[PDB]
């Protein structure tokens, strides 16, 4: 359990690369239920650019299934 | 013309400024509950001139981001729609709340009220007859509304209802209201004539919509089976009584209408909602939800309308994947933590991404 470690930041348009679109959305959607529950922070930098989440002030499990 | 994009501030949990979109033809707007999608929706009407009273508050400065909870956040909030034409500069219309009161601008010009819902109806928005935009739990409403009610639709898109007093005045100088009337010479002919003027204003509408909302049923039905009827109680005065709407559901059997599912009055309410836009068509269609009685198979009908005509744009609030997921790009809204809730926004283009396996 202690050796899964991860990343600074995941980008939401690498995790749907050679995704479908009802794969995509559902990973779009996923973003916007960890950041109500903050287990993620969002960055936007212009509309349509990618979405990167950070670690958010509340810890979450099964972060590796969702990422 | 269509709807660029929204820019809110400090508008209910919009807190600061935010653009929304930019709106592609077929825009879902999808997130968690307690998210903001319905304060989204109340933006959307406040600019385009819903009355304070529609929009959950009591006062027009409640609608400042902060002050259900005694925390205002400014002394100012906004909604601006950015309007856009082919050969034409963009024009943006916006309502400011400056003072406690509303103030409209197009264009940062101020204008009154009355300037500000004329030239929206230039555009095809009407902000009396609001055929445009259908809330949350109504979209069934509209194929169950009280025959009567209908008329009033039809009064107003049309304006033969700007002849109802007159007509009415006439009516009773011609003798209505007598036990025995005796119209005669000038007063019956007046009222004869008044009454023509409404029936060819109303008539010019209705028969419009009457004739086209049967093949449009079918194509939302995408079956030729389905059937759509409107027909006035009262032939010869059709605005003084009312409108009766009955359909045969696809490869179905006729029932009355109420016997028929959520989801099959959804689709009614539809055929009729595009069918008045195929005689005065709106910029576009706000469609709160309207997904929530159907089906899988009739979602992707009315998706698969929506993007075969995307003469009209479609701004969809939707919790049903199979919907959302059909359209061009999500807004998805998402809270915030603070005093207020407050709402943001991310969006997100489907197109990039294959609709298959
Ligand atoms: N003027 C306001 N200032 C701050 N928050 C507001 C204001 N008006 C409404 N809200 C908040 O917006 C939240 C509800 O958002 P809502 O649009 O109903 O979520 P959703 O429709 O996505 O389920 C409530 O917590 C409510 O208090």
């Known amino acids: 359990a202690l050796a899964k470690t991860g990343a600074e930041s995941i980008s939401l348009l690498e995790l749907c690369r050679n995704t479908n679109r009802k794969q995509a959305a559902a990973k779009f959607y996923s973003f916007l239920v960890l950041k109500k529950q903050q287990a993620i922070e969002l960055t936007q930098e212009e509309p349509y650019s990618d979405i990167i989440a950070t670690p958010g002030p509340r810890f979450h499990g099964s972060l590796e299934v969702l990422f | 013309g269509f709807l660029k994009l929204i820019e809110i501030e400090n508008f209910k949990s919009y807190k600061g400024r935010q653009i929304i979109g930019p709106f592609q033809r077929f825009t879902a707007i999808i997130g968690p509950n307690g998210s903001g999608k319905s304060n989204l929706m109340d933006a959307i009407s406040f600019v385009l001139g819903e009355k304070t009273s529609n929009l959950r508050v009591k006062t027009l400065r409640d609608l400042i981001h902060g002050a259900p909870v005694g925390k205002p956040a400014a002394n100012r909030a906004f909604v601006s729609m950015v309007y ?131 093949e449009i049923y079918k194509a939302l039905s995408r079956n030729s089976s389905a059937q759509a009827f409107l027909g006035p109680e009262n032939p010869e005065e059709p605005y003084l009584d009312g409108i009766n709407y009955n359909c045969v559901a696809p490869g179905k059997r006729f029932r009355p209408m109420d016997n028929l599912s959520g989801g099959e009055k959804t689709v009614a309410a539809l055929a009729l909602l595009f069918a008045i836009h195929s005689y005065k068509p709106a910029p576009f269609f706000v469609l709160d939800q309207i997904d929530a009685a159907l089906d899988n198979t009739n979602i992707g009908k009315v998706a698969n309308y929506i993007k075969e005509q995307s003469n009209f744009q479609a701004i969809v609030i939707s919790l049903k994947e199979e919907f959302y997921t059909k359209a061009e790009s999500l807004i998805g809204v998402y809270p915030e933590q603070g005093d207020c809730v407050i709402s943001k926004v991310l969006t997100f283009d489907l197109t990039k991404y294959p609709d298959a396996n």
């Not at chain 2, 103030?103 to 555009?123: D, G």
């Not at chain 2, 002849?163 to 019956?188: F, N, T």
């Open chain 2, 84 to 214: 856009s034409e082919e050969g034409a500069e963009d024009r943006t219309f916006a309502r400011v709340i400056v003072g406690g009161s509303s103030e409209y601008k197009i264009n940062n010009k101020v204008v009154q009220l009355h300037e500000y819902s004329e030239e929206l109806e230039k555009l095809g928005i009407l902000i009396k007859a609001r055929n445009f935009l259908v809330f949350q739990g109504a979209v069934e409403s509209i194929a169950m509304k009280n025959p009567k009610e209908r008329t009033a639709l039809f009064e107003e898109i049309s304006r033969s209802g700007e002849l109802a007093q007159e007509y009415d005045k006439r009516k009773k100088e011609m003798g209505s209201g007598s036990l025995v009337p005796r119209g005669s010479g000038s007063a019956k002919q007046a009222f004869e004539q008044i009454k023509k003027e409404r029936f060819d204003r109303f008539n010019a509408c209705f028969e419009s919509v009457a004739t086209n909302i049967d």
